[PDB]
Amino acid sequence: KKNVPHGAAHIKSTFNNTIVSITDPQGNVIAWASSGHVGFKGSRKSTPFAAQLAAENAARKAQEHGVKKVDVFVKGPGSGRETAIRSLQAAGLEVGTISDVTPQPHNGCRPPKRRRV
RNA sequence: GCUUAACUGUGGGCGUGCGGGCGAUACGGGCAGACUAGAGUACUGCAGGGGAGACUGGAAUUCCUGGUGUAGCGGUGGAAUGCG
Secondary structure, X not given: OOOOOEEEEEEEEOOOOEEEEEEOOOOOEEEXXXXXXXXXXXXXXXXXXXXXXXXXXXHHHHHHOOOXXXXXXXXXXXXXXXXXXXXXXXXXXXXXXXXXXXXXXOOOOOOOOOOXX
């Protein structure tokens, strides 16, 4: 295989789930673990417990590829931001730095309209 | 006065008007005007997302291109449509 000394916790933290993609500094997701990856789907995909489970599974894969030092790259808001953060902290990946990597269309494109249920 | 009354006669006021002559010049108005407070013009600056026209930007989205890289992603109160 290979070893990644420093990783990046690219957390696609959708309210649906926190896809914790660990990425080498090159910019390649060496592995990822989401709520479904642990086994959480539907509402359980969006439960806070799924967040630390996904983060911990990703960090276990990180150790499996010898990853210890990771800076945290959290995407948009979801379920279990700080939860996945201290999961990664408690799973062999120290926090390093936290960065809210969220897209900012500064009054740009048009989305769908809305939901009323 | 009609027996009274109803009713009729008599004369007034009334018929508010119009027309003609005569008057007034406060006001309207007409004429001749005049004045700048009104209005309109200049000078000098002040606010600018007032508009129009021509040029440019990248966020961002999606798609497309090359990767790494997974069996999940998104879906909802949950689902199942949808895809991998």
